[PDB]
C-alpha cells in the first residue's frame, strides 16, 4: 500500500549505525530519485552520500565550526546517525533551461525547487520501508562552500537540503493534523 | 513495494473518466496530502478537487479564454480527463510563519515551494497505484483570479500546479534517465 508506505515514513532524531545492508541503502536512494519525476524530465536533483568517516567529517569537521564559527559573530545526534545525504540542484541545466525556453525563464527555478522537494520524500520514504528512520536539515548555505570543496563538488551544485539518517532507536514523537475542511474543496 | 510505486507513476495525457469509484479516489487523494511531510508540520497545502460539469467548467470556460485572450495579445484533451486537482500554497500561514521565526523568514517561501511539489508527486503517485494515470500542468498565474472567483476561494491560496487525472486511454511514453556517474557521489 503506497498509502501505508507514505504513513510509515516520519522524523526519526535518535538514529544509531545498526543498518545490514548498506549497498541495498544505496540502491533505493538512487531508485528513489531515478523514478521521481522532474519538469522536462530535466533530472536537475544531485546527490552526496556520506557514511562511515564522511559522515563524521561532515558534522565534525564542517558543520561544528561552522555553526560555533556563525553563532560567536549539540550535532552529535546528527553525528551518531549511520549517514548523511545532501541533496543539490544543478543550476547549470537550470540555466540552460531558461535559456532553451525563454518564456518559461521564471518557472525552471521554481520547478526546480519542487524537485528537491519531491526528491528528498521519495529518497525519505524508501529508507522508511526498509524500516530506516530519517530526518531532514537545512545547514545550507552556511556549510556550502566546506561541502563543495571537502568532496571536489561542481560549483553549479545548490545544496538545499541534508537527510539525515540511520537505525531506528527512539519512535517518531506525536503529530497533529489540519481540518479536513480547512485544505480541501470538492466540487462537483 | 514502494520503488515500484513510483516506478508506476508516469505523465498519462490520453485521459478519460472510465473510473469506477470517485468515492475513494478523493479519500485516497486527501490521505496522500495528509500523509506528506511539510516544515514545521505546517501543512501549507490547500487543493481545489474539480470533476463533472465543474472539470467541465475550468476547462471551457476559464483556461480556454484565458489561454485565447492571453494569445491574441487543443485543451480538450485536458477537459475528456475525469477531473482536475489543482493545487495551491497558503501564504497566510507562510506570512505568520516568518512573522513567528523572522530568523528562517527567507527558508519558508522555498520550504513552501518544496511542500507543493511533495503533496503533488505523492497524490500523483496514489493515484496511479489505483490505475488512474494523471498529467501535470501549470497554467498559473494565467487563470488564478478566475479560479478564485468562481470557486470562491481564500485570497491567501496561490495556485502552483494543476494535476489533470483520470482513466488510462494511452501509455505513457518513452523516457531516458541520467548517467548514475553524472548525479550520484557515493563517499566513505
Ligand atoms: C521542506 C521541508 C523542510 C523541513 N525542515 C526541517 C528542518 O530544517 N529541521 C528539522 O528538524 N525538520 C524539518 N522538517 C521536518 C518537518 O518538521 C516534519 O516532516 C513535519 O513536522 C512532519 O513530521 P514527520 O516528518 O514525522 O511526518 C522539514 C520537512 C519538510 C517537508
Ligand atoms: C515540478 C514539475 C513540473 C512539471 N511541469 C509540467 C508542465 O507544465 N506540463 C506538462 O505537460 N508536464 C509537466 N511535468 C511533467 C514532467 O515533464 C514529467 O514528469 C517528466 O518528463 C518525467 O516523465 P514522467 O512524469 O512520465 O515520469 C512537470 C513535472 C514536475 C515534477
Ligand atoms: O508545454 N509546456 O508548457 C510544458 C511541457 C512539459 C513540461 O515539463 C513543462 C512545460
Ligand atoms: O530548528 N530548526 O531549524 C527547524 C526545526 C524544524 C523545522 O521544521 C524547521 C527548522
Given at each position: 500500500s503506497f498509502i501505508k508506505s507514505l504513513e510509515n515514513r516520519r522524523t526519526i532524531?535518535?538514529?544509531?549505525?545498526?543498518?545490514?545492508d548498506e549497498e541495498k541503502v544505496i540502491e533505493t536512494i538512487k531508485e528513489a530519485v531515478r523514478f521521481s519525476p522532474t519538469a522536462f524530465n530535466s533530472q536537475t536533483g544531485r546527490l552526496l552520500i556520506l557514511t562511515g568517516d564522511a559522515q563524521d567529517k561532515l558534522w565534525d569537521e564542517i558543520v561544528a565550526p561552522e555553526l560555533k564559527a556563525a553563532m560567536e559573530a549539540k550535532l552529535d545526534g546528527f553525528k551518531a546517525a549511520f549517514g548523511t545525504i545532501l541533496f543539490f540542484e544543478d543550476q547549470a541545466v537550470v540555466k540552460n533551461l531558461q535559456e532553451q525556453f525563454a518564456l518559461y525563464a521564471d518557472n525552471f527555478p521554481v520547478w526546480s525547487e519542487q524537485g528537491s522537494g519531491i526528491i528528498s520524500v521519495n529518497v525519505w520514504t524508501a529508507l522508511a520501508e526498509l524500516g530506516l528512520g530519517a530526518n531532514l536539515q537545512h545547514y545550507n548555505p552556511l556549510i556550502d562552500e566546506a561541502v563543495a570543496k571537502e568532496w571536489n563538488l561542481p560549483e553549479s551544485w545548490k545544496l538545499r537540503g541534508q537527510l539525515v539518517f540511520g537505525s531506528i532507536e527512539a519512535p517518531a514523537g506525536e503529530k497533529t493534523f489540519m481540518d479536513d475542511a480547512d485544505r480541501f474543496i470538492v466540487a462537483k
Open positions: 532524531y535518535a538514529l544509531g549505525r545498526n543498518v545490514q
